[PDB]
Write a protein that binds this ligand. Structure first.
Ligand SMILES: Nc1ncnc2c1ncn2[C@@H]1O[C@H](COP(=O)(O)OP(=O)(O)OP(=O)(O)O)[C@@H](O)[C@H]1O
Length: 201
């Protein structure tokens, strides 16, 4: 079916902005992470399973999931990242496939996690990995987390090793100047995706 490009990024790399730029070019962007929040709404099955599995600590008083706490758990505990990915993957897949059927752009962009299981995303034509320099990440994390540079630096020391994902990506968008250069690179990628979608079946 539809020519699809998976969008990934390391933390504070700018990938959301990248998605916005593709969107502005008329490209339908599917956000796996938004789907995930949707499908873990109050009293969905996944919501119940997450809470029963992790227990009451991940339930805020207003009954929504403690998504921050669940991230902390999941980034520190790989077995749990996998449990969670495997719980949600079936329902996420289905919601993605629906959106792919009614996709109106020449290709689709699908924002997926940095360490995505290809086997859950076998349908991708390309993988785009966005990355930003350490400095940039640090400046970004500090504005967003309001932490020391040393904490940001600690936050990043924990970041997953990229070298395997780098090798896997078909394109790597190095987000290392300003928004303006970022846009220009997205246009070049866009033109690349149009050309390949045009000539590949
Ligand atoms: N190259 C850049 N120069 C200046 N500002 C930028 C640049 N890239 C992104 N920004 C700004 O950084 C902010 C962070 O947005 P961003 O797209 O980083 O989210 P993100 O990296 O996808 O978040 P996450 O940490 O969940 O991956 C935005 O205000 C954006 O405009």
């Amino acid at each position: 079916m539809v020519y699809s490009v998976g969008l990934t990024g390391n933390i504070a790399s700018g990938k959301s902005t990248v998605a916005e730029f593709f969107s502005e070019l008329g490209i339908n962007v599917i956000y796996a992470d938004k789907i995930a929040k949707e499908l873990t709404s109050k009293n969905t099955p996944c919501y119940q399973d997450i809470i029963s599995h992790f227990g009451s600590s991940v339930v805020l008083n207003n009954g929504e999931l403690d998504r921050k706490r669940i991230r902390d758990i999941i980034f520190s505990n790989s077995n749990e990242r996998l449990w969670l990915e495997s719980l949600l993957h079936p329902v996420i897949r289905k919601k993605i496939e629906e959106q792919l059927i009614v996709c109106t752009s020449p290709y689709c962009l699908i924002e997926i996690p940095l360490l995505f299981n290809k086997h859950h995303y076998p349908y991708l034509q390309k993988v785009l990995l966005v990355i930003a320099p350490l400095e940039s990440q640090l400046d970004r994390i500090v504005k967003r987390d309001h932490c020391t540079k040393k904490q940001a630096l600690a936050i990043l020391a924990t970041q997953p090793n990229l070298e395997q994902r780098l090798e896997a990506a078909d394109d790597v968008l190095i987000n290392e100047s300003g928004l303006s250069e970022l846009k220009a690179k997205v246009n070049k990628l866009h033109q690349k995706y149009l050309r390949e979608a045009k000539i590949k079946q």
